[PDB]
Design a protein around this ligand. Structure first.
Ligand SMILES: [Cu+2]
Ligand SMILES: [Cu+2]
Ligand SMILES: [Cu+2]
Ligand SMILES: [Cu+2]
Ligand SMILES: [Cu+2]
Ligand SMILES: [Cu+2]
Lengths: 340, 340, 340
């Protein structure tokens, strides 16, 4: 028997993150989480396209789980009988049994309890992986999230200095493969099973129809922009379970970036754009220096602007004219100019 | 008021680079640059395909700007009235206001002056970003270049040793999206606006029709091959504002490579092939050891050979038979051989 | 004349590797290898699709060559008269003459002998590169392999500690471009020349029809699963000569990963998923901690499950319930549960 204190965590919906400590003096615990599979139709773009999604806890991405190195993570995975297919879970943070996949296959009406030891620090993908062609289909239907395993001393810069965030956001990026009819319009289906054959045809050509953050084009823009303040160190965890991405904070930088996402490696400093290899999570820390709107994109700008992959930060504070200033506002080009 | 000496820089067309110092004892300056937007039809391949391009200073890529850490960069952006649309500029090297984009939107007939402080070392992309779907369209129409921010002590190897280049070249890689007609032939248009709708359809499928260096297939081959000599340390700056690339010098290596392009990080040593994440610049230093023709490619060889993405170096010097030699020239396979 | 001892190596077919030492006290040698080009029809998927392949030594990938830093590698390349086209070889490990390509062009019925000095440590791609559009076509038809140049002291972790593998496997990943007829079925051809025009059309769209390890979907699953044991440190060399990949060991990690594949750089630790930039080889060391089946994939799961890119490891040993355990097997969801 494993004789450690137990602590139940209540997950919250992305892009927010459940409460946790960075540095901790607590010893190892059995951290208890519950993920409930939900198959449901969801809206994925600004024109109202719908999609037969499959999710952990009703969101794309699934929620961010946060533990510390040496914790045991005890996950109750639930597959309600309102669902139509089997599901499971593969933690890239875990060791053995296909990440847990081989121990968590559950039919609708069932649940299972998996424990894995958090021996490896970093941010990691988790995803459903039932077997064979169902693996990609469940993942690109939305069944993926991430887990962060923090060192007990918190983050550091790989050169002996502590790093601490004031705020954390989890950006899950999702590649979607939505069939079109002969007229070029997106097709709708009454169940995931009915969508499968047509969807697999799109998947096979490896070109997503949509690339979205937090499950939908515009999810994190407008009213749902991410808030910050000048001076705050913000950790931005980015995951992509199936396909590469290249995150960029427009008007900012990555001050410290773990592109491969693993805290045993020193972060890179001062990046413009980073790279999340498909099947992983990475993380970037940035201290905001200027107020205003920032866009956070994948820097395939076609994906960002035209397929859905733009988030906004709204940053409060005072403008720093030393860092940047408009010396002269737009004006007519001088009559006496020559420019050739 | 900012009370520093001013220095006007005259830019030159890629792949060359304006004169500059590596290590410097000069203190911070206000470095003055002018970029003039030019919309124009350009030839992009060997069969004479034309393209409605949009450029900074009439080239793809735009010119390389070079400053040092702590300089202020004062850019006059000009949009002549012969142009048809609004433009702006986003410096990935800059902090705030969408990289400057939010302070530089100018209509045809206008100019604007932006100042940004060069607080971050490395090579960085700059690009136009007017807003929404115009962002990718302006970038993939050719409106992108790069800026290098050198440490005042010059480059180093991240282990306490100075690195110095004898020669520098800037390779801007451009993904292009050219519409085809029903017969499969590339379409021509009389203006960028007229090309837009058809071009956006190609863009949406994320597969370029052309991938080119210095604006055209064959730009840097033949008569325009890049020159070097045996023994020279050559810095090769590579940018890609929208899409990943994987540079490789055929017959050489990357002796010191900043793949993510930022000089606060130690370079990697002895690479065969590196990776420029879309939306960034990187840089590789190589000391030539052998004379002859080298091809410089993205190592998706289909893109390199068939879509336009090959440059040549012509290197003068003496062959080193210790490093490589043809022991036996091609000859008939021996009658008495067995090879099974 | 180069006056060193000569040692003939007998290559073996991937995923296995010819016998070699890791650390060695032997001084530099002239290591002699022979590669024989074979053009032949090969089966590439589970439905029996055939393909006009071009290979080194009859396999995709070509065999792994292993030498040490400072060795000279003397390669006899043979192009039998049963072949139909010219071939050559470009070693990314070599310096000059397009990696050897410019010194090894041989017609059917000819052979050539190239020597290159192993001055650069790591794993490296080699591939055919006859010229122009034949370069990608020969590579994506299967003419690529890898060479490993070990330090004479063996591998280390970049922080002063020796690393040693108990077992080594070479996974060559191949992107294939197989034409389809009007009904959507893969086309068959009687020679590589006859396949060329239709194949180049698929290549131009940059989307492979198949992505395979060891030359075929399912090559390294079932009876040909890779064996290991709990406690063994296994080096997994992964190459991709034309296109990016993102390797992942399902249920494991990369304990030490040289993603760019070059042993002068310290490996990254504890990766979930790594990235092989097209045109390179990388390598991951992992010590198995749990028995069972592991899948080894590229983590574009569509490519892995649906286009062919899954291998299996079968690992013997004792299960470690501390690392992972099934706390409760699948069971009906409690009548008294609430889950909303
Ligand atoms: Cu599922
Ligand atoms: Cu996975
Ligand atoms: Cu513009
Ligand atoms: Cu940008
Ligand atoms: Cu060949
Ligand atoms: Cu190559």
């Amino acid at each position: 028997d494993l004789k450690l204190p137990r602590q139940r965590v209540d997950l919250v919906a992305p892009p927010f993150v459940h409460v946790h400590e960075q540095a901790t003096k607590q010893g190892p615990k059995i951290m208890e989480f519950k993920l409930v599979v939900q198959e449901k139709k969801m809206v994925i773009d600004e024109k109202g396209t719908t999609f037969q999604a499959m999710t952990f806890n009703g969101s794309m991405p699934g929620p961010l789980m946060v533990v510390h190195e040496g914790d045991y993570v005890e996950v109750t995975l639930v597959n309600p009988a309102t669902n139509t297919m089997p599901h499971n879970i593969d933690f890239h943070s875990a060791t053995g049994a296909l990440g847990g996949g081989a121990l968590t296959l559950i039919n609708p009406g069932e649940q299972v309890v998996l424990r894995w030891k958090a021996t490896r620090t970093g941010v990691f993908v988790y995803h459903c992986a039932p077997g064979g062609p169902m693996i990609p289909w469940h993942v690109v239907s939305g069944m993926n999230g991430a887990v962060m395993v923090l060192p007990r001393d918190g983050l550091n810069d790989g050169h002996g200095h502590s790093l601490r965030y004031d705020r954390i956001y989890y950006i899950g990026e999702q590649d979607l493969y939505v069939p079109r009819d002969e007229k070029g319009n997106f097709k709708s289906y009454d169940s995931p099973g009915e969508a499968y054959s047509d969807t697999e045809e799109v998947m096979r050509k490896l070109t997503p129809t949509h690339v979205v953050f937090n499950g939908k084009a515009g999810a994190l823009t407008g009213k749902n922009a991410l808030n910050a303040n000048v001076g705050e160190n913000v950790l931005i965890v980015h995951s992509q379970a199936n396909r590469d991405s290249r995150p960029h904070l427009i008007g900012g930088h990555g001050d410290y970036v773990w592109e491969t996402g693993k805290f045993s490696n020193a972060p890179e400093t001062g990046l413009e754009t980073w790279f999340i290899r498909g099947g992983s999570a990475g993380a970037a820390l940035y201290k905001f220096l200027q107020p205003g709107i920032y866009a956070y994109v994948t820097h395939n700008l076609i994906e960002a602007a035209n397929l859905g992959a733009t988030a906004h930060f709204k940053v409060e504070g005072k403008w720093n004219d030393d860092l940047m200033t408009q010396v002269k506002a737009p004006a007519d080009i001088p009559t006496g100019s020559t420019n050739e």
